[PDB]
Amino acid sequence: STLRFVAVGDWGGVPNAPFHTAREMANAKEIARTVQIMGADFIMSLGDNFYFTGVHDANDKRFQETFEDVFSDRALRNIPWYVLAGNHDHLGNVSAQIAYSKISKRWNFPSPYYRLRFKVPRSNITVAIFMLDTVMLCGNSDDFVSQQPEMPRDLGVARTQLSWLKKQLAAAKEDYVLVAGHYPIWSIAEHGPTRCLVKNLRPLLAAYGVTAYLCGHDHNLQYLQDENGVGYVLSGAGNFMDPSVRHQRKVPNGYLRFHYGSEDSLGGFTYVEIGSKEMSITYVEASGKSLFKTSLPRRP
């Protein structure tokens, strides 16, 4: 078989009851239908888990109303979720989202950033994934008028995570290596590229042979690929859909391979399947149709 998972981001419903939106429910439904057909080993969250100010504590009702009861289909039962934090989560209590891992079996958020290691059946194929906390690296975009994470709140905190990732990447023996964070490195939409990540994270990717970087933040679906062969998967349409293509001129020519952000769309997510020969990525719209699909070679 193969390693399979769903990647969805920015799905955190809303602050007022019922605490979920039509788009979030449509995506939850289609995620269930996808699982019923292809199956899934786990679901990855790319940040902005609870709009617009995260949660207060680990007993916050939002955990049941925005998460548990939305992804309640029988098919989604028992499927593990690996979470990472976005900027809106940081306006609240992130320690509470980490502590919730001890309350809900499916919810796995051991710390701000961590390493995951998977071993694909039969195949000798191994996969490593590094979940980052880009807010601790670039600061909260909500703290600035430009809406761009200008600088980290703490030097030591940022410097340490970068040192951790570099040492982890310079030792990973896995066949596939993925890195995920909320903020985008490359993006043509509303916010566009995050200067801090382009200057501080991007360089590490090609140097150590990273397969791809996954993220959300900009509310749409995108696939970009640089000249070194690294893939950029943007999946932040789990709750909103922003049509903007405002920063397409800020992305190097040739990088944009796919984009969809129609405001009349219910949103979407991605389905990833990693096999012995390659990793494929399918973009699925909540309505039920697959919009695009690409593959990425195995790491030398």
Ligand SMILES: *[C@@H]1O[C@H](CO)[C@@H](O[C@@H]2O[C@H](CO)[C@@H](O)[C@H](O)[C@H]2NC(C)=O)[C@H](O)[C@H]1NC(C)=O
């Ligand atoms: C953020 O959320 C965490 C998780 O609920 C809170 O941690 C609790 O802290 C109190 C001490 O004030 C302890 O008695 C509890 O046992 C802790 N809960 C857990 C699950 O460890 C933390 O206090 C919250 N921070 C704020 C500012 O509200």
Ligand SMILES: [Fe+3]
């Ligand atoms: Fe968001």
Ligand SMILES: [Fe+3]
């Ligand atoms: Fe965000």
Ligand SMILES: [Zn+2]
């Ligand atoms: Zn935004």
Ligand SMILES: [Zn+2]
């Ligand atoms: Zn487009």
